[PDB]
Write an enzyme that holds these catalytic residues in place. Structure first.
Site, PDB file in Angstrom:
ATOM      1  N   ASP A   1      42.167  40.789  14.155  1.00  0.00           N
ATOM      2  CA  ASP A   1      42.980  39.798  14.846  1.00  0.00           C
ATOM      3  C   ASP A   1      44.413  39.954  14.346  1.00  0.00           C
ATOM      4  OD1 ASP A   1      44.022  37.467  16.129  1.00  0.00           O
ATOM      5  OD2 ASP A   1      41.999  36.612  16.171  1.00  0.00           O
TER       6      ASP A   1
ATOM      7  N   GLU B   1      44.178  36.865  28.237  1.00  0.00           N
ATOM      8  CA  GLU B   1      44.177  37.447  29.579  1.00  0.00           C
ATOM      9  C   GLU B   1      45.618  37.641  30.037  1.00  0.00           C
ATOM     10  OE1 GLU B   1      41.715  38.729  31.047  1.00  0.00           O
ATOM     11  OE2 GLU B   1      41.556  38.244  33.183  1.00  0.00           O
TER      12      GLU B   1
ATOM     13  N   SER C   1      38.549  39.468  32.701  1.00  0.00           N
ATOM     14  CA  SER C   1      37.761  38.825  33.746  1.00  0.00           C
ATOM     15  C   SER C   1      38.368  38.954  35.136  1.00  0.00           C
ATOM     16  CB  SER C   1      37.568  37.338  33.428  1.00  0.00           C
ATOM     17  OG  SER C   1      36.283  37.088  32.882  1.00  0.00           O
TER      18      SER C   1
ATOM     19  N   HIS D   1      32.803  43.917  30.373  1.00  0.00           N
ATOM     20  CA  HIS D   1      32.940  42.484  30.605  1.00  0.00           C
ATOM     21  C   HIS D   1      31.717  41.751  30.062  1.00  0.00           C
ATOM     22  CE1 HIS D   1      33.528  38.949  33.651  1.00  0.00           C
ATOM     23  NE2 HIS D   1      33.940  38.639  32.435  1.00  0.00           N
TER      24      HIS D   1
END
Lengths: 724, 402, 402
Positions: free
Chosen positions: A362, A421, A448, A469
């Protein structure tokens, strides 16, 4: 009557009588690798059981064994799926003949022992249940159960009747029959389904003949006699006439209706009816009652839907149907997950669970460490419930390595990005690890909505960039949607495909398109619910419609999980391409109204439901005044069909556009990815298996669609490809 | 053709369930004791004229099986030509016995009929007889079987009756049944139960709690005994009533009917039959009607049955002096009052099953005999008796004072 | 007032007790099978005009408890306003349901009524319901309880029917039953029982033994099943019939009715109600009656019940074209035939329960449907249907072909 069907096939059973009089029936179907209850087996067991009767004077015991790696698994699904309602007589007589063989083997007057070496599933366990003693080998991969309900059927080879005689109405239904639970040999002995265990498959037949020799000596009168065939037999938990069981018996159909949420799944209802109706009569009448209920299920449509989806379609996928041909296997040594959110942490857990070494990166070490804590809390849950040991739980967590440095992606040959996203963020995130990972490292993305081809331009090895996904919670959602960009090679496809099976999930291969298949289709499902809410339908009726349609979670609750701020981004994104003039879904107005009020979903703390402390707590009371609920009151079946058809119609669009390459991917992908109801067999099978007041079949689907289109909008008009 | 009149209507006191006075009394003895009282009132009656005895019984098993009506005829020494049939239409079995008797008298083929009911709920608990709608999973799963206590809570939820609302009605029923007893209203109709030695076993309605307060009713817990606390039923009810999010469980043991033992008897005959026997007619059966409503809510049956029996008699609510509805649950009575717009002072004026108890098989005949007395006492003209029934049925009867 | 007409009268075949074809069929399903047949015969009938379903049932317990009539209405998708009540008048319950249905129509308060009965004796044995008359010593002692078979033997002893006399009638019943089946008499009224899939379960009365001979019947032994092999009952009967020294036990399993499963349905309504649904009236209910005789003999009940229904219809024995008495025991039919001087050509012309069986709750409706069909076949006018009842009761109905 006869132990045969009629009044040609190969021989399946091997006969062996020893000097002590013990006959060893060894099942070995030469047409496959697994013994299956086909027409050859019925004929071969008919001849074998005829011989057991004719030679009864020289026979002292029987041992049922197998020559395959499994014991006996499943029935003839290629034939049961073709049983039309007019074939009900043939289906009845077949299962009646199967059970007359087992009943003769069971009342032979001498001990019969099942030597279970491998998986005894479905009809195979029904064979062993007809024996007097069951010995299983505690080996890996061995399972025992009656999973007919998962195909929309019931155990018609005596499984319902015998388990009820062994465990009672309540225990047999809840633990064995209702969900078709599969048991490992250690657990099978504990619940009383198997009698004893052995270490290796070589000891089974010797241990079996030893038990027969001992049973004949120690129990000369009760040898070859089942507990329910003795005088003074008492069913565990009582019969339906027993006052103790009668007091709670009315609550069995209501509990079952609570678990199924009112969905039109006929098989569990039939299993409970067959179970109880059978306990009120003798054993032979109970077995005949069970036959009639079995014939009722097979000639129905739901069973054909579930047989198609959960047997044929699922097998075609696991067999590599969507996997490119000619490509070989490639190992995975080090998985690198970018982003430690709920997705990345779940991806790190399911990968560490399979044995892979996972590097969880991260932007801060604090963030990556919280991501591993998701795996710790999950392992502490399974350690408390006794589903794993302290050693395997420590080895699992040790494989997850949280980090914040891009240099710790050294040795990674499988990257799974799960960050926010946004395109240019994904471009920068890949651009700073693409040079550290192995030269053949898969560059997967868990987006997505964003097209995979666009994200691929941010790397230099575009042939290895691919969409992987996942669906939250990753640890419990079984599907992985593998998106093929127009630069993705067939090798990258097969490598992600094999990775998906290795972690215990089912893959579907989907061509690159905005919304893919799962996001695009689940959108139409949620958008139907919001539209109805705007129209004035009661929010509780919308939720009841989603549950009674068969969805795992009702649609308004699902919108809060997806968060409306994501849904509103999808609408602006799919509109910016139309720019033309955009044709908005009616749900777009409800989303903006809730965002205007500050109720975007569970992430914010308020949505269509109220969220006090951590858990959800009932619908928002101000919801009825905002959208004037109660003003529109359509039939519940119209609400149910609007949600099912919207997805079914959208799925057919994906098939026409080339987003999907098979209906198996459509059916399994819709069931396992977005929660389409299993009784439909998938959102593609729903079309051919639709049944309502207008009839049954694809033509019935088109008529109902046109009826819905006349009442609720032209988005329900069937595509040209469904017409004559 | 022939008009059917009521000549006598007596009942036993209702003994409570826990440590009840009538627990040692066989249900056959409850009926024989009432037959013996009818003889005492008319020792000159020609019992050969009695052509049938019709008794309601919801649990006709054990002490209540074997056609208990015929057992009463034989055990009481009535003529062997007096018939004897048992019937079961759930809570309306008592009033259905009366209605059927009236219809048999009208046909001309029966002259003088005994009707009533008997239910010893402490000896034969409800559900003792089994049943397909409850114990067969195939049909249970289809008819959406739900205990009646949950339909009552659902009624309160849809209609918006609060816990204080149903508790307010429970208090009224207690106060009115208490005033009725202390006013001597029941003095002529309640036949005290005695043992074989003449010793008194019971002479009043034990289940009554006359010193009830609204504060005590609120301390009670919602129903959690029997099938209501088993599980699944609330979700089953909401699957049909899908626009309701949650059921407000308001009914407790203080605002629901009580479980008691009792029996009732009614003598019904034609004018010619009574004149021939020296009997004085007390009231006339004007019309009967059976109807029903949804079987999942189960307790909305009174409304269409009351509406149907008012059309058959050419009457409206304004023409009826007294409305007697069985107090199975407080919300059923409040739902009924709201539908037909019944005035308060016309509705269950002498208290109901919440105060005095609900002996299933007999209750229809008891509240019927209650209305015969109150019409004669008030010197009023008409009364409408109705009951909610299990499975969504309803039965209603209109009697006129003579 | 209103004339009551029979519109449809159907029945299931009777399945035998030991290894019976109907043993696997729930008694609720036997009724729903007959309701579905009526829908097939009249698809356009407005089922909202059906105001009550009345089913006879002698052992309403277990699968037959909980008001199986209402379960039939709910399980068969009938309108929820169609009621549903179970009654019990022992062996006459089936005919009592028809009679009460007819009397409800006459009163004008009912519109269109389904009557009938159901009894799965192989699943719910006789006596399953208990009963105070037999299971309470105080009652059992006073009213002198005697099982029905010993009353039948006492009838044969008094009247002088020999073992060959009763065995001669038994052979007569088997013969006329087989001739009725061979001639196609029952082709339209016996509805074969099928399963959830449409497969055949039973299409004929499998208790029939058509190859019966006189010598075969003479080999059987007197009744030794339950309630008879137990001592005392012989002396109890003779304590009341003290002039009889010895009871001649002549009844066996070959001259007594058979334990079977079955059900029957009869549709009854006013002339206006049938005209509105396009139904064709098949017969008219002319009069009903209920009487009784000694309860220790238990089976001399049909004699006063037949005389009473004849005097109420203004008729005599000569005016009746066909007599139908339930064949519980041969001596009961011979006694009935002797008392009223019935010609043999008119008495149970299609056989009876000795051949085809006796499903207690349904037999009344079954033999009524037999007589409606035989009146139309013979083109005859009047038929009288009566049954002997346990406890000493009697019920009789006169029907006229329309």
């Amino acid at each position: 009557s006869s132990h045969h069907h009629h009044h040609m096939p190969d021989n399946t059973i091997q006969w062996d009588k020893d000097a002590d009089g013990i006959v060893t029936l060894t099942m070995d179907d030469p047409s496959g690798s697994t013994n299956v209850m086909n027409e050859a087996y019925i004929e071969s067991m008919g001849k074998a059981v005829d011989r057991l009767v004719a030679e009864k004077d020289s026979i002292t015991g029987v041992v049922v064994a197998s020559a395959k790696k499994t014991f006996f698994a499943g029935g003839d699904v290629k034939t049961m799926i073709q049983a039309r309602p007019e074939d009900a007589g043939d289906v009845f007589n077949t299962v009646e003949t199967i059970k007359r063989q087992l009943r003769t083997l069971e009342t032979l007057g001498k001990p019969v022992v099942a030597a279970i070496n491998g998986a005894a599933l479905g009809g195979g366990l029904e064979i062993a249940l007809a024996c007097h003693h069951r010995i299983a080998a505690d080996v890996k991969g061995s399972q025992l159960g009656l999973p007919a309900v998962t195909l929309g059927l019931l155990p018609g080879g005596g499984g319902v009747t015998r388990t009820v005689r062994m465990f009672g109405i309540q225990n047999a239904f809840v633990s064995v029959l209702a969900q078709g639970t599969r048991f490992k040999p250690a657990k099978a002995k504990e619940i009383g389904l198997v009698d004893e265990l052995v270490a290796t498959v070589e000891e089974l037949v010797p241990a079996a003949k030893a038990w027969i020799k001992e049973e004949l000596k120690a129990n000369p009168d009760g040898a070859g006699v089942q507990p329910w065939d003795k005088k003074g037999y008492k069913m565990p938990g009582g019969t339906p006439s027993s006052p103790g069981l009668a007091a709670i018996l009315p609550s069995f159909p209501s509990n079952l209706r609570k678990q199924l949420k009112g969905a039109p799944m006929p098989a569990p209802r039939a299993i409970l009816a067959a179970a109880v109706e059978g306990a009120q009569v003798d054993f032979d009448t109970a077995s005949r009652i069970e036959s009639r209920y079995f014939a009722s299920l097979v000639t129905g449509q739901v069973a054909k839907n579930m047989m198609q989806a959960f047997f044929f379609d699922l097998q075609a996928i696991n067999a590599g149907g969507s996997r490119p041909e000619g490509i070989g296997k490639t190992p995975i040594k080090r998985i690198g997950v970018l982003g430690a959110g709920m997705m990345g942490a779940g991806i790190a857990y399911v990968s560490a669970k399979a044995g892979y070494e996972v590097v969880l990166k991260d932007v801060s070490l604090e963030a990556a460490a919280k991501g591993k804590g998701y795996s710790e809390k999950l392992e502490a849950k399974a350690l408390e419930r006794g589903r794993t040991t302290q050693e395997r739980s420590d080895a699992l967590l040790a494989r997850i390595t949280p980090t914040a440095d891009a240099a710790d992606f050294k040795g990674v040959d499988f990257v799974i990005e799960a960050v926010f996203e946004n395109q240019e963020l994904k471009h920068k995130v890949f651009g700073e690890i693409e040079d550290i990972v192995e030269p053949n490292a898969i560059l997967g993305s868990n987006t997505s909505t964003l097209p995979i081809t666009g994200l691929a331009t941010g790397v230099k090895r575009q042939e290895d960039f691919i969409g992987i996904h996942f669906f939250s919670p990753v640890d419990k959602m079984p599907l992985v949607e593998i998106i093929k960009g127009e630069k993705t090679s067939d090798e990258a496809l097969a490598r992600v495909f094999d990775y998906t099976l290795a972690i215990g999930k089912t893959p579907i291969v989907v061509n690159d398109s905005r919304g893919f298949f799962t996001s695009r289709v689940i959108g139409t499902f949620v958008n139907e619910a919001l539209a109805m809410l705007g129209e004035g339908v009661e929010p509780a009726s919308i939720e009841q419609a989603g549950s009674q349609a068969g969805y795992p979670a009702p649609p308004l609750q699902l919108s809060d999980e997806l968060n409306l701020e994501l849904m509103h981004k999808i609408a602006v994104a799919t509109r910016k391409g139309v720019e033309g003039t955009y044709q908005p879904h009616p749900a777009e107005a409800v989303v903006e109204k809730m965002i205007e009020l500050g109720r975007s979903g569970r992430l914010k703390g308020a949505g269509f439901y109220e969220y006090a402390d951590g858990k959800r707590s009932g619908l928002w009371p101000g919801l009825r005044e905002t959208f004037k609920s109660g003003s529109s009151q359509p039939p519940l079946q119209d609400m149910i069909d609007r949600m099912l058809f919207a997805e079914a119609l959208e799925t057919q669009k994906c098939l026409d556009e080339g987003v999907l390459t098979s209906t198996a991917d459509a059916n399994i992908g819709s069931i396992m990815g977005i929660g389409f109801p299993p009784w439909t067999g998938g959102s593609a099978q729903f079309i051919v298996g639709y049944s309502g007041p207008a009839g049954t079949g694809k033509a019935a689907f088109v008529a109902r669609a046109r009826e819905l289109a006349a009442a609720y909008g032209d988005r329900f008009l069937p595509p040209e490809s469904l017409l004559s | 053709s022939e008009e059917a009149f009521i000549y006598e209507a007596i009942r036993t006191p209702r003994g409570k369930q826990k440590n009840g006075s009538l627990h040692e009394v066989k249900p056959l003895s409850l009926v024989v004791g009432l037959i013996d009282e009818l003889r005492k009132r008319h020792p000159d009656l020609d019992e050969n004229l009695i052509s049938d005895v019709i008794l309601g019984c919801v649990s006709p098993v054990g002490d209540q099986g074997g056609d208990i009506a015929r057992a009463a005829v034989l055990a009481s020494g009535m003529p062997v030509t007096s018939g004897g049939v048992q019937l079961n239409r759930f809570a309306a079995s008592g009033l259905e016995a009366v209605n059927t008797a009236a219809q048999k008298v009208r046909s001309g083929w029966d002259d003088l009929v005994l009707a009533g009911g008997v239910e010893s709920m402490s000896r034969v608990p409800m559900g003792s007889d089994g049943g397909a709608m409850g114990l067969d999973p195939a049909t249970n799963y289809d008819v959406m079987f739900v205990p009646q206590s949950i339909g009552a809570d659902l009624i309160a939820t849809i209609e918006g009756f609060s816990r204080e609302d149903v508790d307010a009605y429970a208090l009224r029923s207690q106060q009115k049944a208490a005033e009725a007893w202390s006013g001597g209203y029941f003095a002529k109709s309640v036949v005290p139960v005695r043992d074989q030695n003449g010793l008194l076993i019971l002479d009043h309605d034990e289940h009554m709690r006359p010193d009830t307060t609204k504060e005590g009713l609120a301390k009670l817990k919602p129903a959690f005994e029997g099938l209501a606390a088993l599980g699944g039923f609330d979700d089953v009810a909401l699957q049909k009533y899908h626009w309701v999010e949650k059921i407000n469980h308001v009914h407790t043991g203080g605002n629901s009917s009580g479980i008691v033992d009792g029996a009732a008897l009614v003598m019904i005959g034609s004018a010619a039959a009574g004149k021939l026997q020296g009997l004085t007619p007390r009231a006339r059966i004007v019309a009967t009607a059976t109807s029903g409503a949804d079987p999942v809510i189960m307790l909305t049956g009174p409304t269409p049955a009351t509406r149907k029996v008012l059309d058959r008699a050419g009457l409206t609510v304004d023409d009826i002096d007294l409305f007697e509805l069985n107090e199975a649950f407080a919300s059923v009575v409040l739902k009924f009052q709201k539908d037909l717009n019944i005035p308060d002072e016309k509705l269950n004026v002498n208290g109901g099953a919440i105060a005095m108890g609900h002996p299933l098989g007999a209750t229809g005949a008891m509240i019927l005999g209650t209305m015969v007395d109150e019409l004669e006492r008030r010197n009023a003209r008409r009364a409408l008796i109705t009951l909610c029934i299990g499975g969504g049925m309803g039965v209603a009867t209109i009697i006129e004072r003579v």
